[PDB]
Assembly symmetry: D3
Amino acid sequence: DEQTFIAIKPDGVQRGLVGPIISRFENRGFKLAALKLCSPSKEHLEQHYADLSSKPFFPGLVSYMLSGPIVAMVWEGREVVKTGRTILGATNPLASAPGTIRGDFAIDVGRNVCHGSDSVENAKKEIALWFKPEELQKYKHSQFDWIYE
Amino acid sequence: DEQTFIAIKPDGVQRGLVGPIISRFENRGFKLAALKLCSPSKEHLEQHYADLSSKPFFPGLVSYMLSGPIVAMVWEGREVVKTGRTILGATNPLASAPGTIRGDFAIDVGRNVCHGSDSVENAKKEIALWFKPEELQKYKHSQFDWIYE
Amino acid sequence: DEQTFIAIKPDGVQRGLVGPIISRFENRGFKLAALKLCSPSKEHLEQHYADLSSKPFFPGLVSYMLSGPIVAMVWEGREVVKTGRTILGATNPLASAPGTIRGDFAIDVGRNVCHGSDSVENAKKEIALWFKPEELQKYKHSQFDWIYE
Amino acid sequence: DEQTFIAIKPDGVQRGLVGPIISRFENRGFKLAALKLCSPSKEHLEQHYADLSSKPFFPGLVSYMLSGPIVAMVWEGREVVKTGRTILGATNPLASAPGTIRGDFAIDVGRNVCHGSDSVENAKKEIALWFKPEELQKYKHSQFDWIYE
Amino acid sequence: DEQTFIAIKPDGVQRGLVGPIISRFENRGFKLAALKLCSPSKEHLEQHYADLSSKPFFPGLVSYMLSGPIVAMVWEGREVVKTGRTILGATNPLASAPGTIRGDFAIDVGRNVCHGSDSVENAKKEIALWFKPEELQKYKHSQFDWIYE
Amino acid sequence: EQTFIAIKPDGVQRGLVGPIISRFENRGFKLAALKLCSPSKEHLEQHYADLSSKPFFPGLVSYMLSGPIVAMVWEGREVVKTGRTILGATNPLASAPGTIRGDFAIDVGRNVCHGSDSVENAKKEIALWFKPEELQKYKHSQFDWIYE
């Protein structure tokens, strides 16, 4: 099935939200295909945020993204990239509904605790960048037929 | 006060969601008038979904509704039927908001963990079909005066 | 596998503890084999506590157990009667046991939120008393092989 | 940074929602600036609801707001008055999204468990009314730099 | 009924544990009689610690006990003083059971998130020291008859 | 001071990753390392090398191949022993309500988690399952609020 990349940013990790963020995705029926705590290099984060190299916040973003470890995840399921964006809430948490991750945990756009892919095609690009193919796990979910038709 | 019918579907029961769905109705202030785990007959489920005899998904819907036990319930309170639907969410989970049962727990419309009355009319019927008078409980909620004016 | 009878007493139902109590057993991996909200007769309750028919507690214990509706349950799994008691906690909710149901929710031995069989023998007896054979559901937990060796 | 006034109304307190309401604001990363259990005078409550002295519900509102003790709170953070409004949810609980305090806990407008200020200017007046300056705690939030940018 | 004194220490407040700690007392069926966020002087702690000022250590303790705000609480019910100590867990978190506040949240004895009275006569001395008589609220718990016989 | 924690295939398949992780975050222990991996049987044979002689070994290794495992390093004062208290007894039936096995498991062979038995044990399990690049060196934001 469809895959998406979710990262918990350094604020999400330092504020003790790894478990609740993973729960909201487990509880929904999505399957965890990859998971790691990493400290990525600035090259790696410049590639990840390449489409923002242009902008004027990009050096602030990169340097904050360097400021502690990150949890990189792949989640798998029907329409998981789009349903991921709904679970995380609006990029700006002040614009996010309660019951979303940013709606329950975040205030500032620059401490929005989580990153998610904005498309299927950008997800494949982010998964290939953060994970070697061997880190992707191939298993069937114990409750696949209770979750899907 | 007004009554609505809510069923945890086989997927809901088989995924350990019986407690969490009861909690969401209890916590709102709604009163638990009737409750059981049951295995309805093909005939019963065909009567329950009567308005959909027409349609091409109707046989497969019936079979899945037989595929494992169902928790049938009656919740009583001011506009419980309408609020009942808001809590469950849109019948398609991907249209559903986080905060709602389908938005927290479900992906596919064929596995949307819960059925709810579409109206006060249908609620009165679905209650009669699923429950004998002996089984509808008559008691005043301990906290009625704190919940209503 | 083995069975136990558990009932949420009328204090339990009126304090909104049905959801949380069901969750505790669900999450441990016990199977819900029966469930009903019912208002027993007095002879029913008399025969349920028949061992304490003489003892002085009896007529007061009985009148309280009539004060509102009760959730009767059957739970199924390995050693579920003994693990059932561990989860409820000691009869006197000054259990000395936070993490149990009584140790988290209760104070008074006469308002101790739930009843649990003292024994496999007494459970088989109590299950026969409270439930018709039809009400005992026969199905396989979706996750049996991940819960048992 | 911006302050807002939240009160848990007597129904909130009597239903055991103090803990859960406090946790929703904590989890977002708002700073608890002030807190107390108090029973305000009829005269206090009438000045609090001054701009509704002319409305037909006013006399019931005041008597209800006198029917038991209130938890008064000051929460501090970026856009906390507006965000506080979203967290509490619509004044009428039946117009409220699940995932808001009223959306999860309340049914009737006359028992909507919680009060929040309608504006920054309004909140300043409500804080002045309910707390003397010595009850407002000044301190930096341990996680300030992970919450804000 | 009987009263005990429970304080959340500044580690408790700065780690966001006010809501959870209040819930464990609310859910057990104890009645909040007083609540306030305060910053006491090294006078209003001098005699509070008339049993705990001069060990071997406490240039560390009194420095830390005004490192931040304290949430001060009175809780009311049958045996609230011994039950309170049970809920808080052992003074040293590393000898506390999971299910206790300290067992779920603390590590160091010097950051044990919580203080509670050591006896019923100590409670009264600790209550009259932290609270004026007009801060203690007097009201009947909503569920008194479901909590107590 | 470090300890090794592994969510077993059953723990993953029953959706307990988030819950187990929070029970450690909440206590104030720091997450030094985390990954979802499928170890070789040779990896697992070395992990359980102390039970190489025991009857149930091939069946343990076989079961532990039946899907991915979440491997974790948690850091903090007395984290191996407090790690053991949080997990509960190896037999979930002998386990306190409030512990991970006390809340979520029944059979010893489906006990959702593995903890180090010792500081010494932990050091060997960490060295086996993670390379030193993967152990994250950082100060906990709330360190001074957790420890004297």
